[PDB]
Amino acid sequence: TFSWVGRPLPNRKQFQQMYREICMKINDGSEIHIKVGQFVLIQGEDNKKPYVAKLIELFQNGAEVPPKKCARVQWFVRFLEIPVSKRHLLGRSPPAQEIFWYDCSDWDNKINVETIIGPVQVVALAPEEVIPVDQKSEETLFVKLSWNKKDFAPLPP
């Protein structure tokens, strides 16, 4: 379950209150803060890996009733979310830890915070950097490229 931390950010949208941070309690009993700018795993279908998203906004949406805690995200997509026919355009076999910045507006970016599984570390690498492949048996995901529905391209600014 989730709770806001502290005061809302200076108001921007009507009917919404924005927060920098959200508090998530586990059944391991502890409390974890997730902040705007951090990344989360988002529950998708039960047979698939979580979606990965960067949190770009956290908000209490007063336009739903009863009101809900929401996020707006920047999506990433996993290799398997890219059309099979377009996969070869990458020109290599990405590791399971590699994901792609999804640079397209067609999917809606608003989620309910209850779909959040938890934080994930996502790391931006230069194209010529190699993914570790180090130890920690890492839970970290790496991003090199964006995918626009047409081609792979550099990470946006």
């Binding site: 529950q43 067609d106 999917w107 809606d108 608003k110 779909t115 599984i117």
Partner: peptide, 12 residues
């Protein structure tokens, strides 16, 4: 348990 998010279109 995390609720399921269903991605949906539009809303660009």
């Amino acid at each position: 348990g995390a609720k399921r998010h269903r991605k949906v279109l539009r809303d660009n």
